[PDB]
Design an enzyme around this catalytic site. Sequence first.
Site, PDB file in Angstrom:
ATOM      1  N   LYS A 187      47.613  80.618  -4.202  1.00  0.00           N
ATOM      2  CA  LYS A 187      46.775  79.439  -4.382  1.00  0.00           C
ATOM      3  C   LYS A 187      46.235  78.909  -3.054  1.00  0.00           C
ATOM      4  O   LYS A 187      47.003  78.601  -2.140  1.00  0.00           O
ATOM      5  CB  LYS A 187      47.552  78.341  -5.108  1.00  0.00           C
ATOM      6  N   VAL A 188      44.911  78.796  -2.965  1.00  0.00           N
ATOM      7  CA  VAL A 188      44.248  78.305  -1.759  1.00  0.00           C
ATOM      8  C   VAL A 188      44.903  77.037  -1.203  1.00  0.00           C
ATOM      9  O   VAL A 188      45.190  76.095  -1.943  1.00  0.00           O
ATOM     10  CB  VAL A 188      42.738  78.070  -1.994  1.00  0.00           C
ATOM     11  N   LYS A 217      43.003  81.051   1.288  1.00  0.00           N
ATOM     12  CA  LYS A 217      43.650  81.853   0.253  1.00  0.00           C
ATOM     13  C   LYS A 217      44.501  82.931   0.927  1.00  0.00           C
ATOM     14  O   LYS A 217      44.066  83.555   1.897  1.00  0.00           O
ATOM     15  CB  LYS A 217      42.604  82.490  -0.667  1.00  0.00           C
ATOM     16  N   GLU A 240      34.872  78.298   3.331  1.00  0.00           N
ATOM     17  CA  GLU A 240      34.217  76.997   3.294  1.00  0.00           C
ATOM     18  C   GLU A 240      34.707  76.272   2.047  1.00  0.00           C
ATOM     19  O   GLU A 240      34.527  76.753   0.926  1.00  0.00           O
ATOM     20  CB  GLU A 240      32.691  77.156   3.237  1.00  0.00           C
ATOM     21  N   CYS A 241      35.351  75.129   2.243  1.00  0.00           N
ATOM     22  CA  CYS A 241      35.863  74.355   1.124  1.00  0.00           C
ATOM     23  C   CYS A 241      34.719  73.775   0.291  1.00  0.00           C
ATOM     24  O   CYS A 241      33.648  73.465   0.817  1.00  0.00           O
ATOM     25  CB  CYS A 241      36.786  73.240   1.621  1.00  0.00           C
ATOM     26  N   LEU A 242      34.946  73.651  -1.013  1.00  0.00           N
ATOM     27  CA  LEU A 242      33.937  73.109  -1.920  1.00  0.00           C
ATOM     28  C   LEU A 242      34.739  72.087  -2.731  1.00  0.00           C
ATOM     29  O   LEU A 242      35.396  72.427  -3.720  1.00  0.00           O
ATOM     30  CB  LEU A 242      33.302  74.228  -2.749  1.00  0.00           C
ATOM     31  N   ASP A 249      34.487  88.734 -12.535  1.00  0.00           N
ATOM     32  CA  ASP A 249      35.396  87.655 -12.903  1.00  0.00           C
ATOM     33  C   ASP A 249      34.738  86.277 -12.929  1.00  0.00           C
ATOM     34  O   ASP A 249      34.779  85.546 -11.937  1.00  0.00           O
ATOM     35  CB  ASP A 249      36.606  87.635 -11.980  1.00  0.00           C
TER      36      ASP A 249
END
Lengths: 317, 338
Positions: free
Chosen positions: A21-22, A37, A83-85, A130
């Site tokens: 999990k990130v 991750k 890059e976080c979102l 996916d």
Amino acid sequence: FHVKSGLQIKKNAIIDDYKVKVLQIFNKRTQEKFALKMLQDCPKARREVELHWRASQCPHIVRIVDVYENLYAGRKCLLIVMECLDGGELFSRIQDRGDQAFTEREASEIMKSIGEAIQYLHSINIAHRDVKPENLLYTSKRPNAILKLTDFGFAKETTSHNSLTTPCYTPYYVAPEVLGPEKYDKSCDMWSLGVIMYILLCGYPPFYEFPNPEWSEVSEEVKMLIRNLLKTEPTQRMTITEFMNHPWIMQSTKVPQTPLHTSRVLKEDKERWEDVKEEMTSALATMRVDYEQIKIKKIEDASNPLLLKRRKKARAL
Amino acid sequence: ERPTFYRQELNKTIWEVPERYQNLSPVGSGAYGSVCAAFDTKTGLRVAVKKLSRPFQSIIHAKRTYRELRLLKHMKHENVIGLLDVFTPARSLEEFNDVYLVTHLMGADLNNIVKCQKLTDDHVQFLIYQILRGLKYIHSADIIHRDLKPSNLAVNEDCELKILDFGLARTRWYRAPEIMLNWMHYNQTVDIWSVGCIMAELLTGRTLFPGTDHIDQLKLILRLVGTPGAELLKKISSESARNYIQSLTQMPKMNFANVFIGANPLAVDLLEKMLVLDSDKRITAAQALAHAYFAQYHDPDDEPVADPYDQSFESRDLLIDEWKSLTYDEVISFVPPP
């Protein structure tokens, strides 16, 4: 195009460039905001990462920032930096307004955001494979924020092929052919997508069958045959060029702003939504043909408890 | 006999299992529980550790959890995946909330195998025979899989097969006509029908009934098998359904000979017997095994039947804690194979 630098997995300690999990981490010299991750380092985890990395170009795809080859604990771990979102999960945002009516054009301003990515990935011969809620995200939380996607855990390399078939069969019914592949593979994305426009529209599931057609359904007959060409079967399946060569998508943002009831139906009940979430993951895993399974030996060479017994009595006689 | 437990968070989810289980690799999961491939140091086998963290959130969940266990514990057959291990980190009934199931991870599923290899008539012969041999055992206990598909059949390099993932509820393609539209209380043969659907695919390499919706699918089926008759209609419980049926077109049964040209005649002969519209006219597992299409494998002495399965519980109206208790008892009563 423009030759870009290749990916070099920084061998040094990740703890010296970002600050413990990130998972989130805070770099030192910038103190940025920064999703990480982790995994069990190996070629599949590296092959995929190489793909995700070389997939940062598209503004529609999340950007990987740094890939380190480190030794956590006893094992070697390929720790990516992206890059976080914090925009939030796609179905997480809609689920939780409020009054506001998810209007048809909004659903359209979404598919293009996703149909653009596919068109990119597929154009570089990359099959994502996916597409589910947990992998779709927006970038900020406020307005004018675009959605770029995540989790390439199952992407792979497709190979350069091309698409027709019609009308009608003949007298040798049916027979066999190249089992992945450069076509079939792609048709596992469009399914994820079309299977999304439906969960997007009635917020119901093809488990296909449209709503009663009365009932939150107007969408157009042009909106039924579309989710249908996306839906079933992966040979004349709906074509990311053909899909993007559609007025409803091509000339989106002009489409009616028909108000919807999707957000109210799914939010009405948010536990079957988790149940629906599993079946989507189960459905996909059942149509993904990628990791070799066995190569069954000729029955002549094969040898097992049952065969032995049958062969034994086969000689007593 | 409580072994030592070792906890570890795998992908934002906690896993507390016995130490005999090493190298746990998340291999998927869905709303019934998560799955983790691993190595059982006790049997030296790749097993599937299933964890059901939501076993008793409802009487529907509680019962379905007790059902799955009971069924698993009963399965003792070569061509049927059995219960290798069941455990819980709970030291008592009060703290008991998580249950782990342990089966044998053998090879890959039929679906995959197809995508990578073109099987020979010989393969199909042995493969299908094995499915039937397992079915006979099951049906013998009066159970019905109800969800047989290439994705629910494990096979290895040696061609060994095993029936798994039983329908626990009490992608539409391998389902009989009656059950699909719930025309009436199903028959064991409903698994036979699926058997056919599988068989046909293997030989041709194409999906026999790739129908979009129930109607679409139904039309597809009835075009090959034809349309109902007065005898079949009678068995139709729903009047509305009977009404719809009557409204349909002609549909005279198709000769399978023309549909599968180039395939083993014995095979096609078998397909006709299995793919019969009337569930009360579909060849049984036992009968099929006797079919000449399995002469090379048929042994009436080595196709064994199963002990009696008591499904009395199905008609038991109890609370969530009672269904939980019943499940715990079974967990403690478990006696591992040899």
